[PDB]
Scaffold this motif. Sequence first.
Motif, mmCIF file in Angstrom:
data_model
loop_
_atom_site.group_PDB
_atom_site.id
_atom_site.type_symbol
_atom_site.label_atom_id
_atom_site.label_comp_id
_atom_site.label_asym_id
_atom_site.label_seq_id
_atom_site.Cartn_x
_atom_site.Cartn_y
_atom_site.Cartn_z
ATOM 1 N N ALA A 4 -74.566 10.930 57.404
ATOM 2 C CA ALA A 4 -74.040 10.313 56.193
ATOM 3 C C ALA A 4 -73.984 11.355 55.084
ATOM 4 O O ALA A 4 -73.058 11.361 54.269
ATOM 5 N N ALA A 5 -74.983 12.233 55.052
ATOM 6 C CA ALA A 5 -75.037 13.286 54.045
ATOM 7 C C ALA A 5 -73.847 14.220 54.232
ATOM 8 O O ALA A 5 -73.186 14.595 53.265
ATOM 9 N N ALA A 6 -73.577 14.585 55.481
ATOM 10 C CA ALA A 6 -72.457 15.471 55.788
ATOM 11 C C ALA A 6 -71.134 14.811 55.422
ATOM 12 O O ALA A 6 -70.224 15.464 54.906
ATOM 13 N N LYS A 7 -71.024 13.514 55.689
ATOM 14 C CA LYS A 7 -69.807 12.787 55.367
ATOM 15 C C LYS A 7 -69.564 12.815 53.859
ATOM 16 O O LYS A 7 -68.429 12.974 53.410
ATOM 17 N N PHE A 8 -70.630 12.668 53.073
ATOM 18 C CA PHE A 8 -70.490 12.707 51.624
ATOM 19 C C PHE A 8 -69.951 14.071 51.202
ATOM 20 O O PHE A 8 -69.072 14.161 50.346
ATOM 21 N N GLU A 9 -70.485 15.135 51.793
ATOM 22 C CA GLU A 9 -70.024 16.473 51.453
ATOM 23 C C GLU A 9 -68.556 16.662 51.821
ATOM 24 O O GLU A 9 -67.795 17.266 51.067
ATOM 25 N N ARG A 10 -68.155 16.127 52.970
ATOM 26 C CA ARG A 10 -66.771 16.256 53.408
ATOM 27 C C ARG A 10 -65.800 15.493 52.516
ATOM 28 O O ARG A 10 -64.732 15.996 52.178
ATOM 29 N N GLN A 11 -66.176 14.280 52.125
ATOM 30 C CA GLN A 11 -65.303 13.454 51.302
ATOM 31 C C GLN A 11 -65.335 13.723 49.807
ATOM 32 O O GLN A 11 -64.328 13.543 49.124
ATOM 33 N N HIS A 12 -66.482 14.159 49.296
ATOM 34 C CA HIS A 12 -66.622 14.328 47.857
ATOM 35 C C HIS A 12 -66.958 15.685 47.254
ATOM 36 O O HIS A 12 -66.949 15.820 46.034
ATOM 37 N N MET A 13 -67.258 16.684 48.071
ATOM 38 C CA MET A 13 -67.596 17.984 47.511
ATOM 39 C C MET A 13 -66.503 19.037 47.629
ATOM 40 O O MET A 13 -65.931 19.229 48.693
ATOM 41 N N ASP A 14 -66.214 19.705 46.518
ATOM 42 C CA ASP A 14 -65.250 20.799 46.502
ATOM 43 C C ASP A 14 -65.694 21.760 45.413
ATOM 44 O O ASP A 14 -65.089 21.850 44.342
ATOM 45 N N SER A 15 -66.773 22.474 45.706
ATOM 46 C CA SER A 15 -67.360 23.426 44.775
ATOM 47 C C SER A 15 -66.481 24.641 44.490
ATOM 48 O O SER A 15 -66.451 25.138 43.364
ATOM 49 N N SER A 16 -65.775 25.113 45.514
ATOM 50 C CA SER A 16 -64.903 26.283 45.401
ATOM 51 C C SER A 16 -64.213 26.423 44.048
ATOM 52 O O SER A 16 -64.545 27.311 43.261
ATOM 53 N N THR A 17 -63.253 25.545 43.782
ATOM 54 C CA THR A 17 -62.511 25.588 42.529
ATOM 55 C C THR A 17 -63.318 25.058 41.348
ATOM 56 O O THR A 17 -63.995 24.035 41.452
#
Length: 124
Positions: A4-17
């Motif tokens: 679930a933690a990984a799914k959150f990162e996939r759907q909601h995290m975009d630190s790059s930009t």
Amino acid sequence: KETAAAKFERQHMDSSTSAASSSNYCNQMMKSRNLTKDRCKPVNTFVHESLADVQAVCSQKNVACKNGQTNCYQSYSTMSITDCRETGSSKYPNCAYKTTQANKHIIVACEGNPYVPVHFDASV
Ligand SMILES: O=c1ccn([C@@H]2O[C@H](CO)[C@@H](O)[C@H]2OP(=O)(O)O)c(=O)[nH]1
């Protein structure tokens, strides 16, 4: 399998930009992150802060979740985010979204051990 933690990162995290989401950002991102596989996910938010800063929200302001659960937390500081909302004429599989950048406090639901974000509840 994907946690679930990984799914959150996939759907909601975009630190790059640092947040420069073009008007095309959401169309690209929603597809690249596999959020339009079975259907066009109606609403989805991407957070541009560091993973550490977002994970830290689980120890911040405890607030009620929209569903009534008690495990939601609001960030004390505002965060750089990009909201993706499906257009009224979006036609799956050709999912189309409106991209809107903003700086708001995020509210996430946290679970597990470690206690981390597993759902993006809202931004205020
Ligand atoms: O501001 C918002 C509000 C909702 N959501 C996602 O859309 C789902 C339905 O509201 C919410 O469940 C949530 O998806 P989830 O994190 O659960 O995968 C956002 O991303 N941002």
